[PDB]
Design a binder for this molecule. Structure first.
Ligand SMILES: CC(=O)N[C@@H]1[C@@H](O)[C@H](O[C@@H]2O[C@H](CO)[C@@H](O[C@@H]3O[C@H](CO)[C@@H](O[C@@H]4O[C@H](CO)[C@@H](O[C@@H]5O[C@H](CO)[C@@H](O[C@@H]6O[C@H](CO)[C@@H](O)[C@H](O)[C@H]6NC(C)=O)[C@H](O)[C@H]5NC(C)=O)[C@H](O)[C@H]4NC(C)=O)[C@H](O)[C@H]3NC(C)=O)[C@H](O)[C@H]2NC(C)=O)[C@@H](CO)O[C@H]1O
Ligand code: NA
Length: 278
């Protein structure tokens, strides 16, 4: 899989980038999935569009989501409802109350209802709890993911999740949860960015990332940053080439394509080859 995201700020730039062709290759050739990060939990079992008035409020609406969806439908690209908990910083409390026994079914229902309402192709879960794991949070989050997975499966829809890239800390969800998440999802985006690479250390090396996904490495997407042309002692293109040669995917955060290296034909050609035809 090859995924990218549209954050809820600077949206005009991301929208322009969707239609770019860098001398013949661009996002329409490289992505299988596109994820507008436009929704948040309300904390009581429901969901909401982003509402911060200093974000791209002119785009937090159904018509703008359908622009993305219709763009992707031309190519067989899938638009994913991306729900996150970072509107005002990363707030795990919004997730913890959503995945409790009282609200969990309502939360799944609200997510799926919104995806169906807009004729989207699946859900990209981007709910982040830095240093927030506990036994209760692990259980409840995995019960949430299993229920969401079963519901989306019956609808023929895709499910992806973004996680922290390490396992040795107390993050949720992180690579210590991959063995339980892999059977439930179509893809996992490891949010390693400049901390993971060919030459990084241990679990954060790309070999270590793939090893932690050993149950189903074809479902792993290595997270790579649009604002850098290199990290961990390799070029952006080299990092993509490692994914190509080692049977994993790529997750590009994000569609602002801020560094010129991500505005080049070569890297989009490589992503197109990783993706394959749709
Ligand atoms: C201390 C301890 O006890 N243990 C240490 C342990 O914690 C360490 O583990 C590391 O912790 C850090 C900190 O928690 C982790 O860093 C976080 O990682 C996640 C996942 O990568 C990041 O979230 C995703 O990644 C991108 C890139 O950061 C996110 O994009 C950012 O999103 C924010 C919020 O929307 C954007 O901010 C907005 O920016 C606009 C424009 O500038 C501005 O107008 C807005 O006002 C502003 N809004 C807000 C609310 O701030 C920001 O621009 C954007 N960044 C970029 C580059 O585009 C994206 O949303 C997340 N989702 C997806 C999908 O990618 C998270 O952002 C990041 N937190 C911080 C503070 O940077 C780290 O992952 C983790 N590392 C590992 C390996 O586990 C370890 C290791 O260091 O050491 C222990 O000691
Ligand atoms: Na852990």
């Amino acid at each position: 899989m090859v995924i990218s995201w549209i954050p809820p700020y600077n949206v005009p730039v991301s929208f322009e980038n969707l239609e770019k062709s860098f001398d013949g290759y661009g996002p329409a050739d490289g992505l299988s999935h596109i994820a507008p990060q436009f929704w948040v939990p309300d904390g009581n079992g429901g969901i909401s569009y982003v509402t911060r008035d200093d974000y791209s409020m002119d785009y937090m609406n159904d018509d703008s989501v359908k622009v993305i969806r219709d763009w992707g439908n031309q190519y067989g690209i899938k638009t994913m409802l991306c729900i996150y908990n970072g509107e005002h910083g990363w707030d795990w409390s919004l997730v913890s109350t959503s995945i409790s026994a009282a609200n969990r079914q309502s939360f799944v229902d609200a997510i799926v209802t919104e995806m169906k309402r807009l004729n989207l192709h699946g859900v990209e879960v981007d709910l982040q709890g830095p240093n927030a794991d506990s036994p209760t949070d692990t259980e409840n989050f995995l019960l949430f993911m299993e229920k969401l997975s079963d519901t989306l499966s019956s609808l023929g829809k895709d499910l992806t999740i973004a996680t922290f890239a390490s396992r040795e800390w107390d993050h949720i969800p992180d690579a210590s949860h991959w063995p339980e998440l892999l059977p439930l999802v179509d893809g996992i985006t490891s949010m390693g960015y400049e901390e993971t690479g060919i030459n990084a250390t241990g679990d954060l090396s790309y070999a270590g990332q793939k090893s932690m996904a050993a149950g189903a490495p074809e479902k792993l997407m290595l997270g790579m940053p649009d604002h850098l042309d290199s990290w961990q002692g390799s070029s952006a293109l080299q990092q993509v080439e490692w994914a190509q040669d080692n049977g994993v995917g790529v997750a590009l955060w994000d569609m602002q394509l801020r560094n010129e290296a991500w505005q080049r034909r070569d890297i989009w050609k490589a992503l197109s080859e990783i993706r394959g035809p749709l």
